[PDB]
Amino acid sequence: WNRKRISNCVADYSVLYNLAPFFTFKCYGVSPTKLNDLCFTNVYADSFVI
């Protein structure tokens, strides 16, 4: 487990969308393209191999 409490950031999902290697992308609860219009109290990021 490598959960990261990301803080002191701007959620610049534009450059994340510009990121090339990451291919598959989906969201649940919100539309996939709405990430750029969201604010978060805390950011919980997890990385795994599936």
Binding site: Y17, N18, T33
Partner: protein, 50 residues
């Protein structure tokens, strides 16, 4: 490029849609796409598409 042909759809938002070509909200019609390496790929790379 292939991985973002999913981007071009009504109501969707993306770089190509934001800056190049996007469908109207009330659009009706059809979309077709297919592979083109046999006719457009080039050794050492092409440069006619910008």
């Amino acid at each position: 490029r292939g991985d973002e042909v999913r981007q071009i759809a009504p109501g969707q938002t993306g770089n190509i849609a934001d800056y190049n070509y996007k469908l109207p909200d009330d659009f009706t019609g059809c979309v077709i796409a297919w592979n083109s390496n046999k006719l457009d790929s080039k050794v050492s790379g092409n440069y006619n598409y910008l």
